[PDB]
């Protein structure tokens, strides 16, 4: 897997994407990394759209990142990925 995704000290895998994300749930957001055990950023609501960066695998999901106001890095999760089948489960949002 993973050819054409670095991979960082945690075992995250990332690489850059440049997109917009609209979610369809609620979807819960983080500080720090993309780790569901990391402190709680805040909420995408139905219908909220943010522009991202980048995009990682870790913790059984694929996330994207982007940047708050203050300039935080936050870590949002967007669907299910199982690490050992290199595959994903579906999208909690629409991407553009
Ligand atoms: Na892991």
């Not at 720090?32 to 909220?48: A, D, Y």
């Not at 059984?60 to 870590?75: A, E, F």
């Not at 999760?77 to 290199?86: E, G, L, M």
């Amino acid at each position: 897997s993973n050819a054409t995704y670095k991979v960082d000290g945690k075992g995250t895998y990332y690489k850059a994407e440049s997109a917009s994300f609209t979610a369809n749930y609620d979807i819960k957001t983080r500080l720090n990394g993309p780790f569901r055990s990391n402190p709680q950023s805040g909420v995408l609501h139905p219908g909220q759209t943010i522009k991202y960066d980048t995009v990682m695998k870790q913790d059984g999901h694929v996330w994207v990142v982007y940047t708050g106001y203050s300039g935080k890095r936050i870590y949002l999760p967007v669907r299910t990925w199982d690490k050992n089948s290199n595959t994903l489960g579906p999208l909690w949002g629409i991407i553009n």
